[PDB]
Amino acid sequence: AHSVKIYDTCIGCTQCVRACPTDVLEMVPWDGCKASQIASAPRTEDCVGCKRCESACPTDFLSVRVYLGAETTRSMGLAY
Amino acid sequence: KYGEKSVYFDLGEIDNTTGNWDLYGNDDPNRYNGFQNKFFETFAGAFTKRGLLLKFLVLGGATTIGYLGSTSSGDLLAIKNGPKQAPIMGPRGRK
Amino acid sequence: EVKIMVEKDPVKTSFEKWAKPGHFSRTLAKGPNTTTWIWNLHADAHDFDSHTNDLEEISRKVFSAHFGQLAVIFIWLSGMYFHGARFSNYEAWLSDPTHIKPSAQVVWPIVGQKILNGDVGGGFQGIQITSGFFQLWRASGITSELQLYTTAIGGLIFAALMLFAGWFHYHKAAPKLAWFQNVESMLNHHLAGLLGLGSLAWAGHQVHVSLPINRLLDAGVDPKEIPLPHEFILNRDLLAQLYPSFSKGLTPFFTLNWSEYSDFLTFRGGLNPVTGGLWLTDTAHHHLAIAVLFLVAGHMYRTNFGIGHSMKEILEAHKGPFTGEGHKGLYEILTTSWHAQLAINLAMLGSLTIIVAHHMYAMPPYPYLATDYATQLSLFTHHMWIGGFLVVGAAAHAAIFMVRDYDPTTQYNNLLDRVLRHRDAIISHLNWVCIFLGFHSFGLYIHNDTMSALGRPQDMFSDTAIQLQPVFAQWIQNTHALAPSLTAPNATASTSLTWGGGDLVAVGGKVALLPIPLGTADFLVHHIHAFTIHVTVLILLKGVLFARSSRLIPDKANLGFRFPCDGPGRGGTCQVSAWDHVFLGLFWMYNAISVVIFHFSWKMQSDVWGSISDQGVVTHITGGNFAQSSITINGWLRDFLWAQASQVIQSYGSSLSAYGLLFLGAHFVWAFSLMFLFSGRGYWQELIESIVWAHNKLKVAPAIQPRALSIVQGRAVGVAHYLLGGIATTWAFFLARIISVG
Amino acid sequence: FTPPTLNADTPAPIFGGSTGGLLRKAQVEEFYVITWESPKEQIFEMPTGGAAIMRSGPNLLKLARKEQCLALGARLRTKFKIQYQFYRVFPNGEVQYLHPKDGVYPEKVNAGRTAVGVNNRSIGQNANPAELKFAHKQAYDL
Amino acid sequence: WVTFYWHWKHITLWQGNVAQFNESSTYLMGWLRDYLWLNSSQLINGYNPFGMNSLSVWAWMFLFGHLVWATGF
Amino acid sequence: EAWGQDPLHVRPIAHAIWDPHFGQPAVEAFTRGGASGPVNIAYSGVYQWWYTIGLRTNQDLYGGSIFLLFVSA
Amino acid sequence: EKYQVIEPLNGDPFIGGFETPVTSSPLIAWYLSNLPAYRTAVAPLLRGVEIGLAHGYLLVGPFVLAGPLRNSAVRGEAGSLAAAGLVTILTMCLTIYGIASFKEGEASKAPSLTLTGRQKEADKLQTAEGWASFTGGWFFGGLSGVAWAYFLLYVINLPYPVK
Amino acid sequence: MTASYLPSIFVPLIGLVFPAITMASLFIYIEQDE
Ligand code: CLA
Ligand code: CLA
Ligand code: CLA
Ligand code: CLA
Ligand code: CLA
Ligand code: CLA
Ligand code: CLA
């Protein structure tokens, strides 16, 4: 499906996980920020490409990036 | 069970669970009585698919339309009737 | 219990919040970080629901805003009456209404615009007005400019009164929520006291003022020596010599011998041959009857004296097997949501305005209105556009209610829930009917185009070809033409000269009305109208029904009512919000109303409007080419758009040159809208970044950061400019054409 | 954490039917099943459009998309304070536990979770597409 | 714009009355009326209720282009 | 050939028309350039260009067409 | 607690459908169950023959009364040939649809479960050879129906109001 | 025109038959699963 990437600029605010409508992102332990956590995308095959996770990231430029592509059945959001 | 209670999910009956029903699919086998002629006369189409039926259709459409367009008379088709009045002639004397 | 409930001094009258622009909302009250804030300040000013969750405060704001609108309308009407009093040739038009063009606007001699002061007649120069105010004042019995002045002064007084009322009911004595929720009392008062009593009062005016003055005017009496209305009221012998039944003097009313009032309470129908308008006796009887009907109907609902109807109990009692609880929970919807009421009232007002547009040309209610073709066309087009806009607004506010005010807990297995639950079937069938109508109307037009271009006129859809006669409309006209004979025996004429009978009213040397014929062209154009209306309804109803959720975005209610999209995912979610559905329904309403007004204009200029000679030969403005030219799209392009636009483009150097100027300017505004409609937002944001670099190089970059318009704002600007340009182009074209040929 | 199994004896909410529901995709490709525990009979809004009453106890609802499952679960969590979990069901009878992969919601950081897709550099430190010409890989994949 | 200018300049040159262009091209109403409205009279009469001529194909293509333009809209 | 014999009073012909959808008025409207049936009048300048470069008869054009078929092959 | 005519599809509220009088009335359901398309036990060839016969027979009329030669003496022949050509084109459509949709040797994927739950046999119309037989029968029946309509209308000249 | 029947032959083919074969072949090709 689409490709979702997380960068070291993340601050572990979890706001991208809460905005995801298909449960693609999750928070994992990390040691590069004060929050001691970082976002991750273990199940991007369920990603639809809404980039709501991108709109919720507060860093200057996005620590979470969605690149789109493939456009499989789950990606197109088809119920038929 | 699908209908024992208000449950509508059952792995043992997935067709019922997913709604894969046939609403009007009557399976009564006694419809016609005299149908030997229809089986006999239809051999070019049945069990042919791409080989015979498609080629026959292409040939009998190409030849049919070619014959119709080549053998049509003037009255039926106006393009083959041809002009009948004098040329109308254009401006600046150009013809 | 229905009682008066207010709060004393809820809001202090102070200018402190005037200095704070975005005080009404928490987000905008901080300040302008970016330029978007400014636009937001103007996009959330009247969204009172977004300011707070308190329904009482929202109701108070709505009441006071309505008072402000009433004050504005009073100012506008007072201005019209003032301009009739001073900058008008109303009295000259009274002396000769058939040869003097109405005018009530005079320009200043500054930049050569003084050419716009055309020779309208009566020793006057000014802009020729098409609002119909002259005919309305003629019907009201106004004969002097002093009466217009006193009306204007009263209008200013009433505007000040409404302004004070709004101030008082917001800042001094603000009604509580219980007061606003008394819908039964409100309906009783607005039916008996507003509509019924208003109709009764206007009937009184007509009986005592309009009928005698207008019948003296019809007799040829110079308006100067026509006695004043108070002389008719006081010297009742002067009124009785025009209508003898006044000598009876209210005895027939109370003895129930009402037939003795047949002198001035008639049921004639048709048109007055002298003026071409409706008989004012018929109008007076009409207004009296509807006043009685409304006063009776306003005694239906139970306020606090028992005897009446609880609308909640009426609604809860109406349910059936095909529905669930039926009309259960709708009383709470309509007594707790302002947007639902606004949707219903907007839809009804738009449909009512369309009815007004259709009924005011078939029965011209004012003297010398039918023969004033410019006024007729302007009134029809104006009220058509107003109605269409109101209907689209009703759709918008239905969607807003569905998004924000809808509560699933209190709406289970009722009508709204069940409509939401088979929206797929509704939209499927509406889409199918839209496709079918589009094909079997516009494809018929394209068929006609092709056969005409192929030299096969016998294969077309016309009267001299394959005929599609509107037999049902023709039968309805036939039935209405014979109504006085058998179905309404107490009628002299039919409802309108448009039904039939061979009667032609010709005030002066023009034609007021005549039997309108329907043929293949009318069949085609009505089915085009049906196609456009169904497609508009499809867009709007699909927006309303899918506002909360859909198979694409199941949580569209959380997104809101006015949002751009949900992202490029699921293939792209552009314009999924109900606001965008309204945005497209505006375009489709534009097309529908445009085709409707074009059909009206061509049909009237072709088959109805014209001039009659002494012998009796009736010639028409266009020449009756609608029956054979409207069947072809090339016919519309040539015989209507090209032929009838010859006057707007040749109006330069004359008093109509302003119409040509605005014709071209409206073309410009439409083309300008095209880029807000076609372009995006990232491109303009990057261009703005380059311009901001240029400004920063010179230390002139503002602290309020320039931003491109939002996506929703881009769409709003595009649609606004698009509609303005198109509607103004048509306005200029019609006005120039109909002032030239009339 | 042992994933729970999908019980086939869980009653469904009281719903009167809707045109927004399972279609041919549910019977040829896949569908979803959400389960939650409720303390009382209350009305909620179906993600497909409409209203229903949830049972006073276990519930079992069939959906066509994962996004609808998340929408209903989010409403349940933030409105009724109800724990939920859903599964992906295939036409062959395969059931896959989906949302709480480790029993803890993704918003809360949990040990034992592996970092997938995490890049150890800033977003602006990506390689240019020109350097990766004719190589079947993307700049963000490095 | 380029082709509109070329075409109008050359119509008024070929007809021998260049004064029309010299007087009407300075304002846009002249462009609308003396070029677009004036020169489309024979185009829109390619086929009409009274018959058709050799310009019917160009009238049909004119309307066709209008339709495709609106579908692009 | 007819155009070359008289260029200033002969309209060039592009190709013949065989449209089964035409009516008789369309058949006789499009018969121009001294043709025996409906034809299109060329506006590509190929007649002038080929007359300038020395091509005179239809056999010259046929030879050129065959040669260009060979070149494309 | 009222009668509540309208019901969900087979009692399942989570399937995308409804039970309406239009859908499953005893008369409407009986009518739809006995249409040749829904007679699953009958061979696809005979169902195709019936469908093609009906469709060619109904198609002959519009071409005859609306065609370009409707004012000529060959109106009937022109309309009949137009109907036959449309039948042939639709035969090509059916052939290509069967080629694209069905592969030889695969089982039928048509619903084999009734509303009650009888679990009948799958319909063989949704197979490569089943669709081939259906297409051949439809071709034969369409030509036969066009011929029969032409014979009744013109060769025999039965009295009909509009023709 | 040397052969007047030749347009009446060719135009129907390239107009109806060639599109029919082309679109049928392309539909069969783009619907293959392989
Ligand atoms: C001079 C008297 C006066 C004073 C000092 C106030 C003071 C206040 N009012 Mg009150 N009010 C008054 C008169 C007054 N009002 C009257 C006469 C009305 C009846 C209409 C109201 C109705 C009213 C409501 C309903 C509300 C207020 C509110 C407010 C507060 C903020 C208003 C503000 O800053 O917006 C200043 C806004 C403007 C100056 C815009 C004026 C727009 C006018 C009315 C319309 C003009 C239309 C124009 C002709 C057409 C434009 C287009 C044209 C150019 C082409 C503030 C306490 C608000 C409040 O308390 O906030 C919670 C609130 O909700 N007032
Ligand atoms: C932007 C809003 C707008 C504007 C600028 C106009 C402008 C105009 N209208 Mg239109 N109109 C509108 C909206 C608008 N209208 C809407 C929404 C309606 C539907 C209610 C109407 C219905 C209407 C009628 C029926 C008439 C006009 C007339 C006029 C002209 C004003 C002459 C006058 O003062 O007579 C003021 C109007 C009257 C004296 C007669 C009105 C009689 C109605 C039945 C009374 C209204 C009842 C009630 C208050 C409305 C709500 C009903 C609802 C509760 C069921 C002018 C062209 C008149 C006209 O064309 O004169 C030549 C005319 O007869 N309008
Ligand atoms: C016979 C009683 C009566 C009458 C005549 C009206 C008349 C009106 N009401 Mg209603 N109303 C009534 C009783 C009445 N109301 C009751 C009992 C309630 C409480 C349940 C309401 C609650 C109510 C609300 C909530 C709203 C109205 C609005 C309106 C106005 C709509 C605009 C319009 O078309 O008016 C056409 C007519 C005119 C514009 C004429 C000018 C108004 C004159 C002066 C009549 C005013 C009558 C008034 C009710 C008498 C009390 C005031 C007095 C103390 C001075 C209209 C003036 C709306 C509005 O615009 O508010 C301003 C609105 O939002 N009314
Ligand atoms: C009784 C009539 C009525 C009433 C009371 C309202 C009231 C409201 N509407 Mg509704 N609406 C109506 C009619 C009505 N509308 C109609 C007829 C339409 C169809 C066009 C709509 C379409 C509509 C939409 C699509 C939306 C609203 C919104 C709103 C809210 C206003 C918030 C806002 O931004 O406004 C502030 C005022 C403006 C933005 C107006 C600015 C000026 C406009 C855009 C252009 C003016 C054109 C002008 C005539 C051009 C010529 C002059 C020019 C040369 C200067 C408020 C609840 C909004 C809302 O509630 O959002 C949640 C919203 O999104 N309405
Ligand atoms: C002239 C321009 C134009 C045309 C032709 C259309 C056509 C259509 N629009 Mg669009 N639309 C346009 C402009 C146009 N729109 C613009 C500018 C907007 C912006 C506001 C929209 C916004 C819009 C929306 C929001 C919606 C539509 C809808 C529709 C459909 C109407 C119903 C239907 O499908 O059957 C009628 C179809 C036609 C009239 C198309 C022409 C068919 C002709 C008559 C026959 C030609 C076929 C012929 C045999 C040739 C075969 C070709 C073959 C050889 C290849 C149709 C697809 C609605 C829809 O989806 O349908 C319900 C819908 O919801 N349109
Ligand atoms: C560019 C290619 C092309 C060509 C050559 C034709 C040719 C024809 N069209 Mg047109 N047509 C075309 C494109 C074309 N069409 C397109 C793109 C459209 C859509 C806008 C139409 C829409 C159209 C309509 C709506 C109608 C025609 C009709 C006709 C026929 C004229 C009447 C006639 O022959 O007498 C009368 C006809 C006959 C005597 C015989 C017709 C039946 C023969 C047997 C057809 C051949 C069938 C054959 C088995 C299959 C061959 C094709 C297959 C391989 C795909 C003629 C055969 C008319 C007609 O008669 O339709 C049938 C008619 O009403 N056409
Ligand atoms: C690209 C060049 C070209 C073009 C646009 C046309 C166009 C046309 N030809 Mg002509 N033709 C050409 C080359 C061309 N021809 C050549 C080289 C020959 C010599 C064999 C002919 C011989 C010819 C005859 C004998 C007849 C036509 C006819 C026609 C007309 C109907 C179509 C038809 O039946 O085609 C038939 C075309 C052929 C049999 C020639 C084969 C196709 C050529 C080589 C081009 C194919 C490749 C080309 C690049 C297209 C690529 C497809 C796409 C990517 C664009 C139409 C006006 C008919 C006519 O006049 O009706 C009034 C007719 O009867 N053509």
From Swiss-Prot, chain A:
Keywords recorded for this protein, A-Z: 4Fe-4S, Chloroplast, Electron transport, Iron, Iron-sulfur, Membrane, Metal-binding, Oxidoreductase, Photosynthesis, Photosystem I, Plastid, Repeat, Thylakoid, Transport
First-level EC class: oxidoreductase
Location of this chain's protein in the cell: Plastid, Chloroplast thylakoid membrane
One term of GO molecular function: metal ion binding
Predominant location: plastid
Binding site for [4Fe-4S] cluster 1: C10, C13, C16, C57
The reaction(s) this protein catalyses: reduced [plastocyanin] + hnu + oxidized [2Fe-2S]-[ferredoxin] = oxidized [plastocyanin] + reduced [2Fe-2S]-[ferredoxin]
Name this polypeptide is given: Photosystem I iron-sulfur center
Organism: Physcomitrium patens (Spreading-leaved earth moss)
Curated annotation (Swiss-Prot), chain C:
UniProt-listed Pfam families: PsaA_PsaB
Cellular compartments annotated: Plastid, Chloroplast thylakoid membrane
Binding sites annotated in the UniProt record for phylloquinone: W684
Binding site for [4Fe-4S] cluster: C565, C574
Primary localisation category: plastid
Positions bound to chlorophyll a: M675, Y683
Cofactor binding comment, as recorded: P700 is a chlorophyll a/chlorophyll a' dimer, A0 is one or more chlorophyll a, A1 is one or both phylloquinones and FX is a shared 4Fe-4S iron-sulfur center.
GO molecular function: 4 iron, 4 sulfur cluster binding; chlorophyll binding; electron transfer activity; magnesium ion binding; oxidoreductase activity
UniProt catalytic activity: reduced [plastocyanin] + hnu + oxidized [2Fe-2S]-[ferredoxin] = oxidized [plastocyanin] + reduced [2Fe-2S]-[ferredoxin]
Keyword Iron-sulfur: yes
UniProt entry keywords in alphabetical sequence: 4Fe-4S, Chlorophyll, Chloroplast, Chromophore, Electron transport, Iron, Iron-sulfur, Magnesium, Membrane, Metal-binding, Oxidoreductase, Photosynthesis, Photosystem I, Plastid, Thylakoid, Transmembrane, Transmembrane helix, Transport
Top-level EC class as recorded in UniProt: oxidoreductase
Chain ranges passing through the membrane: 62-85, 148-171, 187-211, 283-301, 338-361, 377-403, 425-447, 523-541, 581-602, 656-678, 716-736
Domain of life: Eukaryota
A GO CC term attached to the entry: photosystem I
Similarity section: Belongs to the PsaA/PsaB family.
Subunit organization: The PsaA/B heterodimer binds the P700 chlorophyll special pair and subsequent electron acceptors. PSI consists of a core antenna complex that captures photons, and an electron transfer chain that converts photonic excitation into a charge separation. The eukaryotic PSI reaction center is composed of at least 11 subunits.
UniProt-recorded name of the protein: Photosystem I P700 chlorophyll a apoprotein A1
UniProtKB/Swiss-Prot annotation, chain E:
Transmembrane spans: 55-73
Domain of life the protein comes from: Eukaryota
Binding-site residues for chlorophyll a B1, renumbered to this chain: H66
Subcellular location: Plastid, Chloroplast thylakoid membrane
Functional summary from the UniProt entry: PsaA and PsaB bind P700, the primary electron donor of photosystem I (PSI), as well as the electron acceptors A0, A1 and FX. PSI is a plastocyanin-ferredoxin oxidoreductase, converting photonic excitation into a charge separation, which transfers an electron from the donor P700 chlorophyll pair to the spectroscopically characterized acceptors A0, A1, FX, FA and FB in turn. Oxidized P700 is reduced on the lumenal side of the thylakoid membrane by plastocyanin.
Subunit architecture: The PsaA/B heterodimer binds the P700 chlorophyll special pair and subsequent electron acceptors. PSI consists of a core antenna complex that captures photons, and an electron transfer chain that converts photonic excitation into a charge separation. The eukaryotic PSI reaction center is composed of at least 11 subunits.
Family in the record: Belongs to the PsaA/PsaB family.
Protein name, entry field: Photosystem I P700 chlorophyll a apoprotein A2
Taxonomic source organism: Physcomitrium patens
Full-sequence portion shown in this chain: 589 to 661 of 734
